[PDB]
């Protein structure tokens, strides 16, 4: 069953072509009517918009060029767009258009109306193992794909995982995604999901994404993360210790998988070994998982959000709106030339 090797090989050729000669200026602001904010993160906002000529809705990520510079995220933003436009996988949100003006950078993605896994997770409390397993399999295949292209995601979390109309995951936010061979050192990500090697400024690799998968699986199944506190600094102390505790309801299989993902020793962490991703795929916790079926989206979703219209946002919280300004003077022109 190594058509996956051939699959990845062709997938790589496809990626490299686009990574080599990226798409640019495929749209403009006036082609959309801005409706409402869907969510916000460290910087910029994501708005639900309607494309005039087609009538389709999209999620427009808006980035203030001046804020990007202030926060020293230039390179990261260029990575985000360059990578987004080049990738293609069933569980990666699609970048439909991208462009820029005097003040901002815009990345228009396909609108995923189901909302964040985060909201559903907090609301319901926690997911059953089969439910969590369903989502986990999708991330596993996603990281196998990304990693095969020398990409590190670095921002795994329920907040960046959207549920589509069929109940499948759509990964968003490549703000910290990077294409790297070897190690890297940036201190980035979300505190609760940081692998110990990131916190210890030792330098790290793809293995950090596998640690984050452990954190994700734990949080979905438990309802709360494996390492939490009121301040990030206290969180790092707990992560570094490595001492983890599992809820009484955790199956023996789940705990064994988690002990292998939330593994401080890189020579022992699953996903980072000789057999690589297959150590995870072949794990007992994933025994009932039909990997091909998952990739083909032929498995029945355990949860299908309520669909009330093409531009319905009932699955997202409401946010304080603010005018999208555009200066008559070009800002940071040289810095974002390739965007």
């Amino acid at each position: 069953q190594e058509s996956v090797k051939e699959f990845l090989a062709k997938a790589k050729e496809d990626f490299l072509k686009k990574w080599e000669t990226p798409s640019q200026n495929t749209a403009q602001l006036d082609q959309f009517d801005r409706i409402k904010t869907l969510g916000t993160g460290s910087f910029g906002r994501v708005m639900l918009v309607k494309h005039k000529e087609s009538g389709n809705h999209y999620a427009m990520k808006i980035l203030d060029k001046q804020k990007v510079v202030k926060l020293k995220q230039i390179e990261h933003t260029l990575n985000e767009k360059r990578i987004l436009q080049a990738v293609n996988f069933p569980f990666l949100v699609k970048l439909e258009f991208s462009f820029k003006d005097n003040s901002n950078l815009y990345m228009v993605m396909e609108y995923v109306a189901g909302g964040e896994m985060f909201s559903h997770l907090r609301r319901i409390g926690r997911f059953s193992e089969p439910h969590a397993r369903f989502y986990a399999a999708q991330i596993v295949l996603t990281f196998e794909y990304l990693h095969s292209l020398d990409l590190i995601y670095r921002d795994l979390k329920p907040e960046n995982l959207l549920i589509d109309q069929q109940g499948y995951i759509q990964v968003t936010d490549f703000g910290f995604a990077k294409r790297v061979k070897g190690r890297t050192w940036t201190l980035c990500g979300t505190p609760e999901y940081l692998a110990p090697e990131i916190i210890l400024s030792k330098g790290y690799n793809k293995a950090v994404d596998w640690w984050a998968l452990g954190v994700l699986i734990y949080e979905m199944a438990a309802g709360y993360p494996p390492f939490f506190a009121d301040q990030p600094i206290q969180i790092y102390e707990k992560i570094v210790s490595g001492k983890v505790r599992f809820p009484s309801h955790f199956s023996s299989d789940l705990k064994d998988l988690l002990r292998n993902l939330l593994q401080v020793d890189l020579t022992k962490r699953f996903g980072n070994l000789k057999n690589g991703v297959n150590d995870i795929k072949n794990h007992k916790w994933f025994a009932t998982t039909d990997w091909i079926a998952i990739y083909q989206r032929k498995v029945e979703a355990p949860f299908i959000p309520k669909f009330k219209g093409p531009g319905d946002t009932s699955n997202f919280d409401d946010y304080e709106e603010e005018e999208i300004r555009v200066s008559i003077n070009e800002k940071c022109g040289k810095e974002f030339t390739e965007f």
């Binding site: 460290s42 020293k72 201190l187 609760e192």
Partner: peptide, 20 residues
Amino acid sequence: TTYADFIASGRTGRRASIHD
């Protein structure tokens, strides 16, 4: 319980990423 302690903490809402 761990649930209670989580629920009463200040990090149950959407978490922001860092760049430190």
